Design a protein around this motif. Structure first.
Motif, short mmCIF file in Angstrom:
data_model
loop_
_atom_site.label_atom_id
_atom_site.label_comp_id
_atom_site.label_asym_id
_atom_site.label_seq_id
_atom_site.Cartn_x
_atom_site.Cartn_y
_atom_site.Cartn_z
N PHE A 56 28.37 53.33 -2.45
CA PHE A 56 28.45 51.95 -1.98
C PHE A 56 29.80 51.63 -1.35
N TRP A 60 30.12 46.23 -2.15
CA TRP A 60 29.12 46.60 -3.18
C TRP A 60 27.75 47.07 -2.67
N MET B 12 22.35 51.15 -13.56
CA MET B 12 21.21 50.31 -13.23
C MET B 12 20.18 50.38 -14.33
N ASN B 70 31.93 56.60 -20.77
CA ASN B 70 31.70 55.58 -19.76
C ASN B 70 30.21 55.15 -19.69
N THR B 73 29.61 52.74 -22.72
CA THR B 73 30.30 51.47 -22.47
C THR B 73 29.51 50.64 -21.47
N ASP B 74 29.17 51.23 -20.31
CA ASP B 74 28.44 50.54 -19.26
C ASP B 74 27.03 50.13 -19.69
N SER B 77 27.73 47.19 -21.85
CA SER B 77 28.16 46.06 -21.00
C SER B 77 26.94 45.47 -20.33
N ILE B 80 25.21 43.14 -22.91
CA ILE B 80 26.03 41.92 -23.03
C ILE B 80 25.90 41.00 -21.80
N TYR B 84 25.46 36.94 -21.27
CA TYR B 84 26.42 36.16 -20.47
C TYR B 84 25.74 35.33 -19.37
N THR B 94 22.16 45.70 -12.16
CA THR B 94 23.16 46.69 -11.74
C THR B 94 24.56 46.27 -12.04
N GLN B 96 28.33 47.65 -11.28
CA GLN B 96 29.08 48.60 -10.43
C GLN B 96 30.55 48.43 -10.69
N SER B 97 31.31 49.50 -10.56
CA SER B 97 32.76 49.38 -10.54
C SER B 97 33.31 50.37 -9.54
N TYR B 116 34.84 45.22 -10.56
CA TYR B 116 33.50 45.29 -11.08
C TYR B 116 32.64 44.22 -10.43
N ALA B 117 31.34 44.52 -10.29
CA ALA B 117 30.36 43.58 -9.80
C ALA B 117 29.13 43.68 -10.72
N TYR B 123 32.43 40.41 -10.23
CA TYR B 123 32.38 39.98 -11.60
C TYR B 123 33.79 39.78 -12.05
N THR B 143 35.06 37.97 -20.40
CA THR B 143 35.55 39.36 -20.29
C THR B 143 37.07 39.34 -20.17
N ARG C 5 36.66 54.02 -19.72
CA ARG C 5 36.59 52.56 -19.89
C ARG C 5 37.23 52.14 -21.24
N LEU C 9 32.51 44.88 -21.12
CA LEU C 9 32.62 43.53 -20.61
C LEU C 9 32.44 42.48 -21.76
#
Lengths: 99, 276, 9
Positions: A56, A60, B12, B70, B73-74, B77, B80, B84, B94, B96-97, B116-117, B123, B143, C5, C9
């Motif tokens: 990407f 994004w 994703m 990772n 964690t993702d 996230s 969560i 949010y 999705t 993304q970072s 991040y998005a 985001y 966050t 990480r 979040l």
């Protein structure tokens, strides 16, 4: 929320009838990532189409390169067919040597 | 010249279709050198980046373990994020970072990145200062508070000023034959009538690396930005890129138009015209 | 080389 793909169809090297080359379909600027891409020869799906790993851009939106080895001829028509969640039906983009 | 290292990470969710697929693609400038995929046992190396093959087991062990950490964690996230944004467990989302460093010719840090998005929208981002955060909305402010409390910016800055810089320098040394070589564009101007009174002048640039380039048209020495059609730079498939810029000109006025090309591979900018 | 990480979040 969602972004429709931009599509470009082109050859790796400037087209030369009789000379081996690569036919490219660059799909970009779309979100989400799931996309259906086919390369066509005279309106029919080409088998053995390879692709790059999903990545990407800074904004994004996703991009992928779809490609296959080919040998252009004056008579043969090539196109890229793309489907995405943002499109009502598949989008066909014809290969034009000048673009 | 100047260089960058970047990782592009995508997680994703796909409810009813297993755990979220996590992918981490690494690049040096416009060269992909590694890919980590949760759908794959081991990473994949790029054949166009053979310089990564000389890393050995300790590099691959630690990178595989960081990636697994990772992925968890993702995936967490992602769970969560539904809370949010008051979202159901039914939909696909999705996270993304993109992070990394930019270095100058001396290999010193020019700037660090960590953004991040969620669902294609910004985001949270680590600001240029590598100390403060830009939260895009009230969910990212939660966050932001959690990361200020855990001093996360300090830990990310450490990576960005340390590991990121030192490893890019090493990658640039090992891959000096390619990573340090700029391939200039091969250029030419094509001409196609549109009507009996207008024609398209298309200025082409092919076989260039890196992707960064400027193609402009001038009419009588004046930039034609507003009237120039510019396609997105596109990969050729052999590491190089292609781009064109087109203008619609009154027939007979072709020689008043000049294409201007700027690229790292060129010692000075080129000027070219239609040569009938 | 990958960054781990530091937190979710």
């Amino acid at each position: 929320i969602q972004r429709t793909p931009k599509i470009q169809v082109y050859s790796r090297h400037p087209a030369e009838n009789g000379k081996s080359n690569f036919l490219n379909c660059y799909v970009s600027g779309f979100h989400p990532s799931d996309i259906e891409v086919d390369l066509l020869k005279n309106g029919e799906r080409i088998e053995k189409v390879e692709h790059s790993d999903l990545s990407f851009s800074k904004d994004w939106s996703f991009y992928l390169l779809y490609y296959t080895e080919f040998t252009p001829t004056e008579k043969d028509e090539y196109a890229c067919r793309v489907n995405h969640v943002t499109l009502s039906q598949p989008k066909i983009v014809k290969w034009d040597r000048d673009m | 010249g100047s260089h960058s290292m970047r990782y592009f990470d995508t997680a994703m969710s796909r409810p009813g279709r297993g755990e979220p697929r996590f992918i981490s693609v690494g690049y040096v400038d416009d060269t992909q050198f590694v890919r980590f995929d949760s759908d794959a046992a081991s990473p994949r190396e790029e054949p166009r980046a053979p310089w990564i093959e000389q890393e050995g087991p300790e590099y691959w062990d630690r990178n595989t373990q960081i990636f697994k950490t990772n992925t968890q964690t993702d995936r967490e996230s992602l769970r969560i994020l539904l809370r949010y944004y008051n979202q159901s467990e039914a939909g696909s989302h999705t996270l993304q970072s993109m992070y990394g460093c930019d270095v100058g010719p001396d290999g010193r840090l020019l700037r660090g990145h960590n953004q991040y998005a969620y669902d294609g929208k910004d985001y949270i981002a680590l600001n240029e200062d590598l100390r403060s955060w830009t939260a895009a909305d009230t969910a990212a402010q939660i966050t932001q508070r959690k990361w200020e409390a855990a001093r996360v910016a300090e830990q990310d800055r450490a990576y960005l000023e340390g590991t990121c810089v030192e490893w890019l320098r090493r990658y640039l040394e090992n891959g000096k034959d390619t990573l340090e070589r700029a391939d200039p564009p091969k250029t030419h101007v094509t001409h196609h009538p549109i009507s009996d009174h207008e024609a398209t002048l298309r200025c082409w640039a092919l076989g260039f690396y890196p992707a960064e380039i400027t193609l402009t048209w001038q009419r009588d020495g004046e930039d034609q930005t507003q009237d120039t059609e510019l396609v997105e730079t596109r990969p050729a498939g052999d590491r190089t890129f292609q781009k064109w810029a087109a203008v619609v000109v009154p027939s007979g006025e072709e020689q008043r138009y000049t294409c201007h090309v700027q690229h790292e591979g060129l010692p000075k900018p080129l000027t070219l015209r239609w040569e009938p | 080389f990958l960054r781990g990480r530091a937190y979710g979040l």
